[PDB]
């Protein structure tokens, strides 16, 4: 009540007049609310949500009023905005004037003496804030401050000898160094002092860290504030090191400080519990300090370059050894001396003083003055020299030794596998997705690990649930008191194969095992377990139960102690055995015992064996007593990890014009078609334009010149310059024969000039990105691009990748209405057929088979029409012979006569009159009849072209081989989901799958790595990628890829699509700007979010969009819903949010509409929480029930599950009364505002959402109308704007509505009677 009253008085939104700025408010809030509550998250949230930063803190900030409390408060707010994933920097961008002063004083505060003016926690907050800054260099205001901290001049923080070493190593650097020193002369004394302080900041910050770290005791109690400071510091180090602009010069600085050696010898890492997170962060930092990249060129280092670097280090150490100390070491070959073991052997016996001296000769430490003792520990000195010179394994070898399954040592580690309870207050040992990556390996590995660790979370839930249900009890044996659908007791387990390693690798190439279960279960469960197939992943589990028989289990309690969890290992089904011992017209097995042969992870196997042999650890693989299966659709993690690893191993040949953009650096526009060197001058736009008028209107800024003046002669070809002039050439589609129905289908969509820009771009080489707001015609743009590419570049193959099968259904539906032969279409998938034709491998093989029959019959008819005898039927083979021998000959003779010249001789010598009798010449002009004859030959030739393509079905009997032919050769358009593409990449590459162009839909719904993988479904061609075009269509202003555990979004931004990253990076986009599915009035609720999003003509002009909704005054309303029986939002189960007042009101409105005669199916009900969804459903069944007058809404579901869907009328419940929740994500808002064609009615606590700054552009519109539902119960042909010719009653709350609907219904039950049975 204190913070809120202050907000109301001084800064809260929607309060006309506020008290003037008062510095004491900032001082009081910081000391008494923030500091005293120990930086309580709920306090900080309340302040942030109340718009403290935007409305009080920053706009009143100046140098004269700046204080500790002021600085800290700003940083707390910024940090909290990051924790909540809302824009953090907007107010600074609005008033940038005092930010440089503010930033400099954040630096001073961060370096302030430990435990001095600023507490260690306060300086941790500053560490995190600065981390956000370094992670935000895309913001000009921030970058302009950070530049001086991380540029070449920062090297004045280096030891003088190390600086000179670097300048000698890269001689071209010295002139730039000199230039800096010169420009420094031109500075006034204070600007010079400020510059030097900024240049030294990071190196000085490192020293502060090192002293904090050293203050941590080995075993004595330690304050958590020291631990967390050290953790956040390493997080900062990682991010600086993992970004090239911050790494470029700082990497040397970090090395010069020897921080990493300090950290690995520290007491903190030695604390098994306290320092565990610190250790894991440390391992990440080590990965980056030794990362395989050239700091200056930014290029990845080759294996040769790595080896040279390592060899040069040893060489210079031997030079120093020979001249000044280690004689035998200096003369030995590198391989002799460069192992950790050898280095310890050679330098371990030496004194501290000698090691210090050695290090000094390598410019690692200052000279040890004569007769002085070193102040450094011998273990530091030794580890310094050893770690610097020892052999390193490469990043690839490191990756190739990783098991693909999580063990029990990983699954419950919440540092790397956080629960959904993760607040965001501590940090995690996780990769982060933002804008840039160092190299392709960095990029691929971050996605590998994030996918790996996120999938591990779902595994834990699967394990904890199924194993708990089994109720493992002590009997020293185990007895299971319960049963589980997804997990069975193991009856037997035996490793049956341990194969020899490939040359080089130290792990078996293959490990297999037999696992037996006893299906003493319900037949439904027996069937599901027998439903296991090859590549299905199962988990092998060892429990040694802790509880006596009958002991109750508590899911709230630590799972591992509850069931006695000892081991978890993964495996992959090879197949079930049959009674002949064969790995599986599937047989009917007898009895209830089933054995599966499985693959074990060979790396995990070797590690376990090594552990057993070396350390006497028990053999894990003799202990398994539970096997757990999973839902197939949620269980692709292993296959995806494998594919990513394979991609990493390969040379990853992506187009050279894509590589830099993919990594997020370099010119974001360099793949635009206008900058591609192979830009095509002349394009056939075919049926894109409906008329010459449509064409001219499609290029507003251009001058159109037609190659033909006659308006009656005006498909179109367009030539683009290399200057605002377009040359348009009309041309004639080649006659396809004497059957006018064989004229091609044509596009009917009058594309806007913006849609045309997208289509134009998609036809050109390079990267085309299309931002398509709700209903702006993404699909029509897509198929037109596909069609244009199909006709312009017949040889080229197009790969289509979407997120959902729904999008594929939509694409193929529209493709069918265009001039595209269905023999060139193919759809891959692992499904309910929703299109008029079947484009699966099965459907396409069947089409070919049926079409082959019909065409061979045409050849027979042709044979007979020519008077050629022969009763045998044709094959594709003999049809080919027939074409060359009987058809081509006749045609060539004919052309020889009439094309080498009367109208009459065109018809008189035409060799195929009888064949086309069922269908010729007009006798008007030669040119016309000749072309008619030409078209007849094209008709016949097409028959034989198809038969030649179909010969493969005569050479390949099985449907699988036949489908392979379509995939590798016949199809020109191949479509699949990104999911399928990830699973099938290995098979596709092995098949020799090839493609030239990629088009994607739903691009902003697709995970980063699942966007990248479709780039590599083929092998390189002559050393280069065959990929010519990349078209991505999506909407980053709508919902992102789904991350099951939102902790991975909060910390790592794992939901961020490649599409979204590219938009952020600055890749130019084509922004579709005219929607065609909803009222203009409804469009206003979300078009504010987009660039110039208006409406198409038919939305503006058709009556169906201006007709009001019967019985409701407004076509949309926001309806305030106060408490019902003292309750607002409720939570019958944790996080199962509901709102009875809102639910009842929504259902009552739905009933009202049904009783008015609304088509119940045209109404869908949406809400932001699953808890409310089930409750609305509950009320639907319990209030409507067996009511004849009331139907069911098409759907009752969540907004997140209604993406890409719509209905005429949407009833929306926002549920929340205490906190705004995940609707604060504007993308969720936009989706919620755009599901309705004609009617949107929203029920919420209006005050709560009004206060949310991010939601203001929508809710300021919604509150422009009454918050009490306006009904017209005696009502349609009433128009949207006209005053109604009925009574308007105002329902002021839910109970009044539920009353009204009851009375209305009881009046309708007496006056009517309908009859369904």
């Amino acid at each position: 009540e204190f913070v809120t009253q202050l907000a109301c008085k001084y800064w809260a939104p929607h309060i006309k007049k506020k008290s003037p700025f008062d510095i004491k408010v900032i001082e009081d809030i910081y000391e008494k609310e923030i500091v005293k509550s120990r930086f309580a998250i709920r306090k900080i949230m309340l302040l942030e949500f109340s718009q403290y930063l935007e409305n009080y803190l920053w706009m009143n900030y100046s140098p004269e009023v700046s204080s500790k409390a002021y600085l800290m408060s700003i940083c707390c707010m910024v940090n909290e905005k990051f924790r909540e994933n809302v824009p953090a920097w907007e107010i600074f961008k609005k008033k940038p004037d005092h930010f440089p002063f503010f930033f400099k004083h954040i630096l001073k505060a961060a370096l302030a003496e430990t435990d001095g003016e600023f507490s260690l926690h306060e300086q941790t907050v500053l560490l995190l804030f600065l981390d956000h800054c370094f992670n935000s260099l895309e913001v000009d205001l921030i970058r302009s401050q950070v530049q001086q901290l991380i540029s070449l001049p920062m090297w004045m923080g280096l030891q003088l000898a190390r600086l000179e070493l670097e300048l000698k190593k890269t001689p071209k650097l010295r002139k730039f160094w000199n230039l800096i020193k010169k420009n420094d002369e031109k500075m006034d004394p204070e600007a010079r002092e400020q510059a030097y302080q900024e240049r030294r900041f990071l190196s000085q910050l490192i020293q502060k860290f090192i002293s904090v770290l050293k203050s941590v005791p080995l075993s004595e109690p330690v304050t958590m504030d020291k631990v967390h400071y050290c953790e956040r510091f390493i997080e900062l180090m990682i991010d600086l090191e993992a970004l090239l602009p911050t790494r470029r010069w700082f990497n040397t600085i970090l090395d010069d400080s020897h921080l990493l050696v300090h950290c690995y010898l520290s007491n903190l890492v030695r604390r098994e519990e306290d320092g565990h997170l610190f250790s894991q962060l440390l391992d990440m930092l080590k990965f980056y300090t030794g990362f395989e990249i050239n700091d200056q060129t930014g290029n990845a280092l080759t294996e040769n370059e790595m080896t040279t670097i390592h060899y040069d280090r040893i060489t210079s150490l031997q030079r120093a050894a020979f001249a000044h100390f280690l004689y035998d070491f200096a003369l030995s070959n590198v391989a002799e001396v460069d192992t950790r073991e050898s280095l310890v052997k050679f330098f371990g016996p030496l004194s501290s003083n000698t090691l210090h001296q050695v290090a000094s000769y390598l410019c690692l430490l200052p000279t040890l003055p004569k007769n002085e003792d070193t102040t450094f520990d011998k273990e530091f000195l030794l580890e310094l020299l050893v770690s610097r010179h020892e052999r390193r394994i490469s990043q690839i070898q490191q990756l190739n030794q990783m098991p693909l399954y999580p063990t029990e040592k990983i699954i419950w580690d919440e540092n790397i596998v956080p629960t959904e309870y993760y607040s965001g207050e501590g940090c995690l040992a996780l990769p982060k997705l933002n804008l840039q990556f160092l190299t392709l390996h960095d990029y691929l590995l971050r996605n590998f690990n994030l996918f790996r660790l996120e999938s591990t979370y779902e595994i834990r839930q699967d394990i904890e649930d199924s194993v708990s249900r089994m109720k493992p009890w002590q009997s020293g044996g185990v007895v299971f008191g319960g049963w589980a659908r997804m997990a069975q007791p193991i009856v037997a387990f035996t490793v049956v194969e341990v194969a020899k390693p490939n040359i080089g690798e130290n792990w078996p190439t293959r490990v297999r095992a037999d696992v037996t279960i006893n299906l003493n279960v319900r037949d439904h469960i027996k069937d599901e377990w027998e439903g296991l197939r090859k590549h299905d992943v199962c988990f092998l589990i060892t429990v040694r139960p802790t509880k006596p028989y009958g002991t109750k289990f508590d899911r709230r309690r630590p799972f591992i102690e509850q069931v006695g969890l000892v081991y978890v290992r993964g495996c992959e089904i090879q197949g079930m055995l049959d009674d002949k011992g064969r790995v599986i017209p599937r047989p009917n097995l007898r009895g209830e015992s089933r054995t599966f042969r499985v693959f074990l992870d060979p790396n995990q196997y070797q590690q376990d064996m090594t552990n057993t042999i070396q350390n006497g650890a028990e053999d894990v693989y003799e202990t398994f007593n539970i096997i757990m299966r999973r839902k197939p659709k949620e269980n692709n993690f292993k296959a995806v990890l494998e594919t990513i690893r394979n991609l990493m191993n390969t040379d990853c040949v992506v187009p050279d014009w894509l590589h830099d953009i993919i990594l997020g650096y370099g010119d974001p526009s360099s793949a635009h078609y206008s900058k591609m060197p192979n830009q095509i001058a002349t394009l056939d736009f075919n049926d894109t334009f409906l008329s010459i008028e449509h064409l001219k209107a499609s290029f507003p800024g251009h001058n159109v010149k037609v190659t033909v003046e006659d308006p009656a002669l005006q498909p179109f070809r367009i030539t683009f310059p290399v200057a605002k002039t377009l040359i348009v050439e009309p041309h004639v589609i080649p006659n396809r024969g004497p059957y006018p129905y064989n004229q091609p289908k044509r596009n009917t969509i009058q594309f806007t000039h913006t849609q045309i820009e997208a289509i134009r771009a998609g036809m050109q080489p390079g990267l085309t990105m299309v931002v398509g707001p709700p209903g702006t015609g993404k699909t029509d743009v897509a198929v037109q691009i596909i069609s244009n590419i199909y006709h312009n570049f017949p040889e080229q193959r197009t790969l289509i990748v979407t997120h959902s099968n729904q999008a594929l259904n939509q694409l193929f539906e529209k493709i069918m209405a265009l001039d595209i032969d269905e023999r060139h279409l193919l759809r891959l998938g692992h499904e309910e057929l929703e299109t008029e034709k079947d484009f699966s491998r099965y459907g396409r093989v069947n089409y070919v088979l049926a079409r082959r029959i019909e065409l061979l019959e045409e050849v027979k008819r042709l044979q007979k029409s020519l008077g050629v005898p022969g009763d045998a039927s044709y094959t594709c083979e003999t049809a080919g012979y027939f074409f060359l021998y009987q058809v081509m000959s006749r045609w060539e003779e004919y052309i020889s006569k009439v094309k080498n010249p009367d109208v009459t001789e065109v018809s008189t010598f035409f060799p195929f009159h009888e064949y086309f009798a069922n269908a010729i010449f007009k006798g008007r002009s030669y040119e016309e009849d000749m072309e008619i004859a030409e078209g007849c030959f094209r008709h016949i030739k097409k028959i034989f072209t198809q038969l030649e393509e179909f010969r493969a079905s005569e050479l390949l009997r099985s449907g699988l081989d036949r489908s392979k032919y379509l995939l590798v050769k016949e199809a020109k358009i191949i479509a699949m989901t990104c999911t399928h593409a990830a699973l099938k990449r290995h098979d596709l590459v092995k098949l020799g799958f090839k493609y030239d162009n990629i088009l994607m839909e739903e691009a902003a719904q697709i995970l980063e790595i699942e966007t990248f993988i479709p780039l590599l479904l083929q092998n390189p061609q002559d050393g280069f990628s065959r990929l010519k075009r990349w078209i991505m269509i999506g909407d980053h202003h709508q919902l992102p890829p789904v991350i099951k555990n939102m902790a991975f979004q909060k910390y790592s931004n794992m939901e961020q699509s490649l599409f979204t990253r590219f938009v952020r990076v600055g890749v130019p986009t084509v922004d579709l700007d005219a929607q065609g599915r909803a009222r203009a009035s409804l469009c206003n609720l979300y078009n504010w979010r987009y660039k110039n999003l208006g409406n198409l003509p038919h939305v503006q002009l058709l009556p169906e969009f201006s007709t009001a909704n019967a019985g409701l005054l407004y076509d949309f309303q926001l309806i305030n819903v106060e408490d019902f029986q003292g309750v607002g939002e409720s939570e019958p189960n944790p996080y199962f949010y509901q709102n009875l007042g809102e639910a009842e009101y929504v259902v009552a409105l739905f009933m009202y509409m049904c009783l008015l005669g609304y088509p119940a199916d045209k109404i869908s009900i949406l809400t932001t929480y699953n808890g409310q969804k089930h409750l609305i459903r509950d009320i639907i069944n319990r209030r409507c029930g067996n009511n004849p007058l009331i139907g069911r809404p098409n759907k009752v579901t969540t907004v997140d599950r209604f993406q890409g869907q719509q209905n005429d009328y949407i009833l929306l419940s926002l549920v929340r009364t205490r906190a705004v929740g995940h609707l604060r994500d504007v993308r969720r808002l936009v989706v919620a505002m755009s599901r309705a064609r004609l009617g949107l009615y929203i029920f919420a606590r209006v005050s709560l959402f009004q206060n949310c700054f991010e939601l203001t552009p929508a809710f300021s519109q919604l509150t422009a109308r009454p918050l009490h539902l306006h009904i017209i119960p005696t009502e349609t042909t009433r128009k949207n704007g006209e005053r109604p010719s009925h009574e308007v009653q105002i329902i002021k709350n839910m109970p009044q509505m539920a009353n009204f609907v009851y009375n209305m219904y009881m009046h309708l039950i007496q006056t009517t009677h309908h009859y369904h049975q």
Binding site: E303, N304, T307, S332, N333, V334, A335, E336, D338, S394, K500, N502, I503, G504, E505
Partner: protein, 122 residues
């Protein structure tokens, strides 16, 4: 397999041919290991050390130091030839020259052959 042999000859005519040859050796012989070592002498280093580790595990017997010598292209490979000698003659000296009498080396070879021991002494 004859087509694989002719294709192996095509690889012998030659990077892709080197891939076909290395695959031909890794397909899973000591003479063939000498051939793959010759491929290391031609094509292309740590991976060669790994395949050399495979050849070493396959047979710990005296040309292996020469296989290690390709990695030197040498003092380190000679050191591997020396450690291999400890694991078991002139090859270590050749490794020393790489870091940089044949008749006595030959009587030594007679010693290297798998009263006889007295001859080994002489």
């Amino acid at each position: 397999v004859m087509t694989v042999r002719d294709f192996t000859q095509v690889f012998d005519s030659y990077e892709e041919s080197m891939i076909a040859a290395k695959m031909e050796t890794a397909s899973e012989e000591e003479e063939d290991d000498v051939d793959l070592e010759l491929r290391l002498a031609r094509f292309e280093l740590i991976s060669r050390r790994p395949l050399l580790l495979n050849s070493v595990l396959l047979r710990q017997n005296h040309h292996v130091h020469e296989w290690h010598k390709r990695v030197a292209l040498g003092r380190p490979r000679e050191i591997i030839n020396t450690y291999t000698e400890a694991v078991q003659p002139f090859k270590a000296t050749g490794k020393p020259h790489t870091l940089w009498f044949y008749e006595d080396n030959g009587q030594l070879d007679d010693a290297r052959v798998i009263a006889t021991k007295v001859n080994f002494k002489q």
